[PDB]
């Protein structure tokens, strides 16, 4: 919901950025995110 | 506001969330890791879906208890310790009585959702003469003490009688027979409301915190060892469980996801909830701690024990 | 594509219940979720089926037509290992069902309630507190006449009952047990049936009176034998109307949207298309209709 | 040719396997062929997802799909590719034209005469075309046949432009998948005030899919299309609709002439597909050049499209 | 506090949350005149007040790893600052002791960041920049086969906050046990722009 | 005017093994592997307790063995991974183009980010149904104060003993439970009570077992044989440091057992790690196209109970990257 | 998979026969391997009557076959399943234009035996072939086949109160997407509808006890006439009427259920075919 | 806030609100008309305190 | 009625609602908003906290007497404690209460 | 049965030199 | 002996064994 799916080369942080993130989503502490189960959680084509 | 002929004994069971701590002494189960393999489940022509699957074997190697599981702290009391009742024309819709003018005037006097759980709770009919030493302090909300682990495994026979025949007395109090007899015994009022040989019209999603006191069934489940009804206990029995974050508390269907103990079906004791019978004495247990009475020339207070000791605060005075 | 569960006991399965569970092996099972690995407490359909509650079968029905099928295939320590149903493969499900039908004109079949008894199919577990029921699986034929027993019970509760608690076949007669309340569900299906019943009974026909007439009066056919020589009055004061054809056409339209509507209401229950029975190895390849 | 063959041979069914029973030598390496096949298509391993791509030709089936010429006046262009259209009959024997619906240009049907209505009229602001398309709206309304008349045809997945006599591509039958082969996925689109979860009204079993329904409905002051999500059978969701129509069979009854057969029937619902029960519908936003409304998306789609049943 | 939120925020958890929150407010808000009710345990006190707001702040960021703050004293990083008022400073300076070093080791200029050759094709062309257009170069165009871990991508966060010399300024270093905050006023920033804090 | 992306960043998942957690104090990994393989899951020992040779003329003291079998729990332990079949599409089909090239790594990339997914899955639900058994055979110490205290028991079973220690139960539900609650509320007597308790977990645990060994799971510090594991939450966690104040080692353990499992343990996680999935698909690549043409530290906080150096682990943080319940 | 499934001619065909049988190659039929038996022509005999709801259930019941190729000593056929899709054509002498309808039917032949069969006169057997239709079309044939029979059968016991004429101007005639046939209207079809009549005939005293199960609401609903029946019946006999009534109900609602019930997705007029799967 | 004299005191010795029912802010629901609404207002169902 | 999160973000962000003048002589709602700057928690869980309440000058005299054996009740007077966040020091000549 | 526990070493056949069947 | 049962009982024989 304004966020793009590019294969992008994503840098590897090492943060605990994890915790507490399927109820943070939920709630909405992020204003536009993408949540991608199964097949979406792919690179995605050029 | 005027009293009946008879008193009542209301059964809540409340809900914890209690931060555990395990203990397990080294070498005590020997493991044997397979090897992971993969197999395609659902091969749609979208998407195909794998899976990943494991098998372990362990094995128990002491012939002691090698593990302890202790509730260290409180993380909070998930229900909401209140008031809210059951609803018998909820939980049995069948039954109604001859006039419908009549039928729908009671269901219009009486009930025909915010916060936490409420914590539904039974009310069991008892005599105004059940003395109030019985209830300060932890005792079955029926009459007689259900001391059946006590007694001999695998014998339903003999320990059917301990439970129900008042022949002999209490396991607890030896000089009477029942503190009421309107409920402890086998086809008695409170034991026609809440065993199961008599609610096949109930509906069955509904949770009774009195099933855990006056089942029949599960009673004489814990007549078997003690070395086995303590793994009874831990082995993920789920008896008498309940929904935990459910609005309106449920029985849970065999629910694994949970993790819960119920101490209260294995010892089959109830703990006194703080009860008075006016507000001054209410207003007089937070002002002396000690040296507040009980009794009240007709008045009671009945001081709260439990697992948990909850801590009471109106307004500035505490208790602990 | 892997169709296979593996429901894993907690507690160790002891060697009668082994027994027990070995000569139960093909037989259908409900199942609780339709994944790879699963837990015997939802495996069955005991969870609707209970020994504390009334027995109400309509409930059962609409769990065995939502929840997924599997056949029970190998049982051993600890674990059941069970083949789910999907269409587009064929099953091989035997008879190991204790009131006997036996399927010689490889009819349809179908997936119904333990309306015959628990006891005989309760198969129970003393390693866990569960208990495993087993469903019926009997042909069509069979099956609309138990289910109209099943209705026909609550609404002759009030007003020779023996024939409507047993059922009929070829062979033998088998008892069933009918409970004295049939439950919400079933007092709900009943409602419906009643609701359809007052309102459809104004959209009846005219002109089959007349044939029912004549032929009491003429003709005595093999199905004519339930009046016993007997026509009624209000097919009188119906056949005081003249007959045409244009209400009676859209009479009859809405009559087979109406008898399409109760086809709905009445087909209960998963049906299992079979082909190729074998009566002497007693097992019957099978999909799902 | 090079490209060519490099792109055919890696495109093709691996072999059968062979046990030749009668020679000595031969049963042995080919038994070591098969637990070498074995060993690498079950380990965790990439060799064990390269099998899987092979789909040894009862698991993928090639679906069916609708050539259907419109007209494109009756259509937008600027639609989301996942929307179910329902084709009208046709009353005349050579015609050459199938008139199908977007649920939007079905919503201008619905209300011209009597959110959604904004970017409705926004995407098809003439209607009176739209209702010359049909030869008969209020009359077939009114003895509500308009149920087998219009019928569906599942989700478009190709829609290829033309500014005279359109031509469009519908999986009427199989996974719903898109016809070019630069692969993609085609998300069903359903616009969320006429889409409502079942569950949500009803307030135990798993199954393994959750089916889409479609139940063209006849309210008292106009059709109404409401896009039903249900986890259970065509046979349960008759009895489940039968419940929610609560209101229905109270003016079925107040309507007390039983002579007069229109309002003796209350819509009919139709199965479109089956979509998974394990990943649910997503929601999401689909924009027109000014407006957006949200729009349910459903992935993984299997159209079969059964009977209108009457409720 | 994740032993509430392991759940999901149901009707229910919904409730208790908003119990504890008054409840909180009602007992441990204010926690600096509080402390003046003991006297012995004012240190410890302040202390496990400080230690407990450390942790509620999700200190897990992308920059975790990029030293850019070090106390002078020894090779550690800071972990944040404590912005307090002049009195508060006052009170903390000696109840939670002296402090442990006088200045942390940060950086002198601004990581600076321009427009160069790669990405002003994109920004005349498309008006789309990416920040560190030559490190998307490294990744996908020179050898994409190697895919980055932890470490191999640690000099590409640290876009420019690495390579810089390091001046030392002044501010009161608190250890909280572990952590080494670092606790300062901005009040004489405004006291003399006449502006409220 | 342009539109800056400010960074794009991704997180690493950290690898958790069921032999670097310190929940493997408490299992020995035996390279067995039989019972799978055996039909039956039972075990039957032979064991033989000692006796007192008594003198008085009440009995013959008969020599005392017990045959007793212990059957094995097998737990199956599944996860499934959608993956996608245009994924599958790339994978098969070999690149010539840098932009299929870079399409195909990434359809590698993202093959090779379900297979790391399924072994770090069954790596988190080993660790799970393992914890799973430790919690089914966890009886809880309300009533193992009593009953693995041999003073009320031992005298036979009768009517009586069972009826005093239910009774001894309902105490210890009361004035013993939430020991860490009570220890708040306590005066200065912080860490005597807590020390108290978790050695009356440590002695009530520890008891006779069959199939021992060496002296496994040592720490490097102190040297001393590591005796169990507290397993707890990260606030107790948090609490029993400031209780108890201090470890016995810097949370450093030197388990020489783990020593076949760098080898059996790795040949998997390293077999999935990239650099041989790129490998595998870089050979069947070349099968396409040749086709046409024809010891360690673990971190684990010891605390010192006594004579026994027990460990103390937190496994939270490998639930909360789940956002599953502990 | 392996689907060709052959039958067993035991004589040769000659060239009528052959031409016969590519006349109908596209078309349907059942199955039981056996030539006797091999499609509906057992019931549609001359060993037994006619009747229709046996038919139906034999219908029903056993599988169903789509040929492909002719032979003079076999029959290629694949048999139906639930999973695939076969190409189906519409090969019958009463033709039904299948434009644009997403469902067909397979019924039992009402049109004659003659209309859709093949006589053969060299083998043992006759097959027939059932008819495969629109369904609009197959429960309007049911309704003026159905009322046709009730209204011949009441003109034969009592002329005076309808016309022979009257009924054979509308229910002789369908009209389905502008196309406008004819019905061939001649026994058959009598138990089917004696079975209808017994269902209206006891529907009144059932809609009683059903709505005594359960006030005035449900009362309401009947008309006058549609009320009034006395109280006073015998208990076996009201309830051996309520069990064969709703014996009958059940066995005539899954008969108006038309059957295998076929679905079809791309009809090509050119070639008279569509891409038909099982539903 | 005018209110009647039959009002106790116990609902004034904690924090709860000035008028009578408890306004709850996110313990009714999430975006709706009904049961927000209808636990702020509706008195036909109890407030979740009391 | 917006989730948890996302009224803890418009908690801080801004004057979320109705504020009023500090430093004025009444009490005005705040129009400029400009250095004024304040966190209000009675928006945030719409609870209001008790005064200290007495009926009568007798309980409030007895109040600072005995703190902990006070009646909140005497027979129809009453005394309300202050149970408000922040705790505020009474002192009614030598005798003081927290 | 008699093997509910015990694993085996060996077996002790029937002196079949070449034969596995029998006791 | 046939099989591998050296680290399920132990090295000690007069502990344990077969």
Same mark, same amino acid.
């Given at each position: 919901?304004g ?10 942080v090492?943060?605990?950025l ?5 109820q943070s ?9 993408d ?12 | ?8 004994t ?7 969330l209690?931060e555990?701590?395990?203990f397990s002494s080294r070498?005590?189960?020997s493991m ?5 393999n993969?197999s ?8 195909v ?6 098998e ?6 002491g012939l ?5 599981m ?10 909401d ?6 609803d018998f ?11 419908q ?7 219009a006097?009486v009930?025909?959702?915010?916060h936490?759980?409420?914590?539904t709770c ?5 005599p105004?003469?059940?003395?109030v030493a ?6 079955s ?18 320990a ?5 025949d008042?022949?002999?007395?209490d ?6 027979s029942?503190?009421?007899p309107?409920a402890?015994?086998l ?8 065993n199961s ?9 509904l ?10 069934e599960?009673?004489?489940?814990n ?13 993920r ?5 309940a929904?935990?974050?459910?609005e ?5 269907i065999?629910?694994?996801?949970v ?6 079906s ?20 937070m002002?002396?701690?000690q040296?507040?009475a ?10 709260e024990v439990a697992?948990?000791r ?11 | 594509? &892997? *169709?296979?569960?593996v ?8 060697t009668?219940?082994i ?9 259908? *099972?409900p199942?609780?979720?339709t ?6 407490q939802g ?5 609707v089926?209970?020994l504390?509650t009334?027995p109400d079968?309509v409930?059962?029905?609409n769990y065995?037509?939502?929840?997924t099928?599997?056949?029970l295939?190998?049982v ?8 789910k149903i ?7 499900i ?10 010689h004109?490889?009819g ?5 309630p ?5 006891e005989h199919?309760?198969?129970?577990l003393?390693?866990n ?7 019926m699986?009997?042909?069509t ?7 109209q027993?099943?209705?026909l019970?609550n609404?002759?509760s009030?007003?020779?009952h ?7 076949? *070829? ?9 004295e309340?049939?439950?919400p ?6 409602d ?18 007349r044939?029912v ?8 056919? &093999? ?9 009624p ?6 056949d005081? &109307?003249?007959?045409?054809?244009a209400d009676?056409?859209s009479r009859?339209?809405?009559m087979?949207?109406y008898?399409?509507?109760?086809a709905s209401?009445?087909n ?6 079979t082909?190729?029975?074998?009566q002497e190895? *007693? ?7 | ?8 041979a890696? #495109? ?9 029973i ?7 390496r080919? =038994? ?5 096949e ?10 064990? =997802? ?7 030709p009862?698991?993928?089936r ?8 419109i007209?494109?006046?009756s ?11 329902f084709?009208f ?13 977007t ?11 009597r959110?959604?209505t904004?970017?409705?009229? #926004? ?5 009176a075309?739209?209702?010359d398309?049909?030869?008969?709206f209020?009359?077939?309304?009114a003895?509500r046949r308009?149920?087998n ?5 599942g ?11 359109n031509?469009?591509?519908?999986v009427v ?6 016809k070019?082969?630069?692969?993609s996925?085609?998300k069903?689109?359903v ?6 979860? #079942?569950?949500?009204?009803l307030?135990?079993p ?20 409401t ?5 259970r059978g ?11 129509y ?8 107040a309507?007390?002439?039983p002579?007069?057969?229109?309002e ?5 619902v139709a199965?479109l597909g ?30 079969? =499209?059964?009977?209108?049943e009457?409720? | ?10 009707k229910?958890?919904?409730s ?10 009602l007992?441990?808000?204010?926690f ?11 240190s410890?006190?302040?202390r496990? !007040? ?9 200190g897990?960021?992308?920059?975790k ?5 070090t106390?002078?004293k020894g090779?550690?990083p800071?972990?944040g600052?404590?912005?307090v ?5 006052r009170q ?6 002296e ?5 942390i ?5 601004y ?6 050759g ?9 008006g789309?920049?990416?920040?560190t257009?030559?490190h998307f ?26 390579d810089?010399? !390091? ?9 909280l046990?572990?952590?080494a ?6 009040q004489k ?9 | 005017?342009?539109?800056?992306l400010?960074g794009?960043?991704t ?9 670097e957690?310190?929940l493997?104090?408490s ?18 020992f032979?064991?033989?307790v000692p006796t007192?040779?008594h ?13 007793v079998?212990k ?12 993956l996608?079949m ?11 183009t ?5 399409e195909?790594?990434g359809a ?6 379900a ?19 430790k ?6 110490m ?11 028991t ?18 210890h539900l ?5 020991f ?8 200065s ?7 108290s308790?978790l050695?009356?977990?440590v002695?009530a ?9 060496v ?5 490097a ?7 169990g ?11 029993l ?5 201090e ?11 783990y ?6 343990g790795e ?9 041989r999935?790129?490998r ?5 690549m ?13 971190? +684990?906080?010891?605390?010192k109970?006594?004579?026994? +150096?027990? +460990? ?6 490998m639930?909360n ?6």
């Open positions: 919901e966020v793009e799916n590019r294969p992008f080369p994503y840098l590897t090492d943060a605990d994890l915790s507490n993130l399927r989503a939920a709630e909405g502490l992020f204003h536009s995110f949540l991608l189960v199964g097949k979406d959680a792919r690179e995605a084509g050029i | 506001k005027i009293h009946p002929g008879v008193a009542m209301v059964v809540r069971t409340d809900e914890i209690s555990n701590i395990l070498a005590s189960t044997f890791i397979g090897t992971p993969v395609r489940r659902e091969a749609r022509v979208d998407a879906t794998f899976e990943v699957h494991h372990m074997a362990s094995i128990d190697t002691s208890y090698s593990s302890t202790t509730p260290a702290r409180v993380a909070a009391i998930t229900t310790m209140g008031i809210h009742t059951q024309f909820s939980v049995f819709p069948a039954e109604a009585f001859g006039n003018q009549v039928n729908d005037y009671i269901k006097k009930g025909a959702l915010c936490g759980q409420q914590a039974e009310i069991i009919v008892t105004v003469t059940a003395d019985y209830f300060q302090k932890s005792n909300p029926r009459g007689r003490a259900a001391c059946v682990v006590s007694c001999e495994n695998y014998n339903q026979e003999v059917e009688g301990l439970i129900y008042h022949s002999r007395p396991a607890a109090y030896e000089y009477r029942t503190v009421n309107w402890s015994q086809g008695s009022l409170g034991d026609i409301m809440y040989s008599y609610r096949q019209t109930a509906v069955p999603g949770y009774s915190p009195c099933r855990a006191f006056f089942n029949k599960e009673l004489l489940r007549n078997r060892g003690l070395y086995n009804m303590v793994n009874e206990y831990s082995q029995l789920g008896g008498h469980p929904t935990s974050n459910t309106v508390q449920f029985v849970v065999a629910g694994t996801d993790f819960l103990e119920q101490p209260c294995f010892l089959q004791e109830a703990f006194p909830a703080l009860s008075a019978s006016s507000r001054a004495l209410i207003d007089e247990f002002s002396v701690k040296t507040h009980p009794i009240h020339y007709g008045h009671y207070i009945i001081e697992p948990v909850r801590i009471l605060k109106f307004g500035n005075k505490v208790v602990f | 594509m &892997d *169709l296979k569960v429901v894993s006991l907690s507690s160790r399965l002891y009668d219940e027994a027990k569970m070995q000569q139960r092996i093909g037989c259908i *099972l199942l609780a979720s994944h790879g690995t699963q837990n015997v495996l069955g359909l005991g969870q089926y209970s504390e009334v079968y409930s059962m029905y065995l037509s939502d929840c099928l599997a056949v295939d190998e051993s320590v600890d674990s059941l290992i069970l083949t999907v269409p587009g493969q064929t099953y091989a035997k008879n190991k069902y204790q009131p006997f039908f036996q399927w004109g490889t349809s079949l179908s997936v119904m333990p309306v015959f008894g628990r199919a309760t198969v129970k003393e390693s507190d569960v208990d495993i029921v087993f469903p699986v009997l042909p034929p069979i099956a609309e006449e138990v289910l027993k099943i209705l019970f609404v002759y009030r007003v020779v023996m024939h409507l608690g047993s059922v009929s076949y *070829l062979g033998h007669h088998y008892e069933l047990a009918l409970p309340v049939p439950g569900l079933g007092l709900a299906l009943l419906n049936l009643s609701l359809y019943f007052c309102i459809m009974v104004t959209l009846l026909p005219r002109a089959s009176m044939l007439r004549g032929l009491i009066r003429h003709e005595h056919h &093999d199905l004519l034998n339930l009046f016993q020589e007997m026509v009055d209000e097919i009188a004061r119906i005081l &109307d003249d007959l045409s054809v009676d056409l009859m339209r809405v087979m949207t008898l399409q509507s109760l209401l009445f209960l229950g998963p049906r299992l298309a082909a190729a029975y074998s190895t *007693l097992t019957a390849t099978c999909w799902l209709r | 040719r090079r490209r060519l063959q490099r792109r055919i890696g #495109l093709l069914p691996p072999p059968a396997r062979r046990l030749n009668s020679r000595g030598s031969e049963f042995t080919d =038994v070591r062929g098969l637990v070498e074995h060993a690498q298509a079950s380990s965790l391993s990439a060799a064990a =997802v390269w099998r899987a791509g092979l789909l040894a009862s698991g993928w090639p679906p069916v799909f609708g050539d259907f010429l007209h494109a006046s259509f937008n262009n600027a639609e989301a590719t996942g929307t179910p259209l084709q009959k046709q009353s005349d024997p050579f015609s050459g034209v199938d008139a199908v619906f649920p939007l240009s079905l919503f201008i049907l619905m209300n011209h005469g959110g959604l904004r970017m409705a009229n #926004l995407l098809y602001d003439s209607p075309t739209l209702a398309l049909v030869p008969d209020g009359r077939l309304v003895d308009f149920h008349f219009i019928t569906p045809v989700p478009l997945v190709e829609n290829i432009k033309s500014t005279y006599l031509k469009i591509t519908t039958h199989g996974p719903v998948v898109s070019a082969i630069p692969r996925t085609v069903v689109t616009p969320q005030e006429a889409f409502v979860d #079942l569950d949500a009204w307030s135990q798993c199954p393994a899919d959750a089916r889409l329904y479609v139940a063209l409905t006849y309210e008292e002051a106009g059709p109404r299309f896009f039903f999500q249900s986890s065509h046979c349960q969701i008759m009895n489940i609709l039968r419940i929610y609560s209101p229905s069979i109270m003016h079925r009854y309507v007390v002439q002579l007069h057969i229109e003796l029937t209350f819509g009919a199965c089956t979509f998974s029960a394990t990943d649910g519908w997503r929601r999401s936003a689909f924009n027109y050049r000014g407006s957006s409304l949200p729009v349910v998306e459903i992935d993984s789609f299997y159209s079969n =499209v059964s009977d209108w009457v409720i | 506090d994740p032993t509430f939120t392991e759940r999901g925020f149901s229910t958890v919904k208790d949350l908003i119990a504890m929150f008054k409840r909180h407010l007992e441990h808000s204010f600096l005149d509080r402390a003046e009710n003991m006297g012995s345990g004012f410890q006190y302040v496990s !007040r400080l230690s407990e707001m450390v942790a509620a702040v999700s897990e960021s992308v920059l790893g990029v030293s850019t703050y106390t002078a090779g550690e800071v972990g600052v404590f912005i008022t002049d009195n508060v400073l903390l300076l000696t109840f939670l002791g402090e442990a070093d006088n200045q080791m940060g950086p002198s200029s990581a600076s960041f321009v427009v160069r790669e990405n002003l094709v994109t920004a005349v062309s498309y789309r920049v990416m920040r257009f030559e170069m490294a990744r996908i165009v020179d050898s994409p086969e190697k895919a980055g871990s932890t470490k191999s991508d640690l000099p590409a966060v640290a876009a420019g906050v690495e810089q010399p !390091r001046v030392p300024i002044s501010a009161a270093v608190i250890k046990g572990n952590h905050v670092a606790v300062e006023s901005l920033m405004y006291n003399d722009t006449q502006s409220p804090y | 005017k342009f539109e800056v400010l794009v960043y997180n690493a998942i950290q690898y958790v093994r069921f032999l957690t310190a493997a104090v299992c020995v990994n035996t390279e067995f592997k039989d019972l799978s393989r055996m039909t039956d899951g039972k075990i039957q032979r064991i033989s007192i040779a003198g008085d003329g009440r009995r013959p003291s008969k020599q005392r063995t017990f045959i079998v059957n094995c729990h097998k737990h199956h332990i599944s996860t499934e991974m959608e996608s245009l994924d599958l599409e790339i994978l098969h089909s070999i690149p010539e840098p932009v299929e090239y870079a195909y790594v590698v990339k993202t093959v090779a980010s297979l790391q997914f399924g072994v770090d899955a069954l790596e988190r639900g080993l660790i799970n149904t393992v914890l799973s058994v919690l089914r055979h966890a009886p809880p309300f009533i193992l104060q009593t009953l693995a205290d041999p003073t009320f031992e005298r036979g079973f009768s009517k009586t003993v069972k009826s005093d220690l239910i009774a001894m139960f309902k105490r009361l004035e013993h439970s939430f860490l609650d009570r220890a708040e509320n306590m005066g007597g912080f860490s005597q009570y807590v020390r308790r050695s009356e977990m002695a645990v520890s008891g006779e077992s069959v199939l021992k060994g002296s496994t799971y040592t720490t510090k102190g040297g001393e044989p590591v005796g594991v507290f397993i707890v939450t990260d606030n107790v966690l948090r609490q440091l400031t209780f108890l104040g470890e016995a080692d810097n949370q450093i353990m030197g388990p020489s057992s020593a076949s499992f760098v080898v059996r040949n998997l996680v390293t077999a999935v790690s990239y650099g999935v790129m595998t698909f870089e050979h069947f070349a099968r396409i196209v040749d086709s046409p043409e024809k010891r360690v530290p673990i971190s +684990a906080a010891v605390i109970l006594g004579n026994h +150096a027990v +460990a103390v682990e937190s496994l939270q943080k639930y990257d789940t956002q599953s319940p502990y």
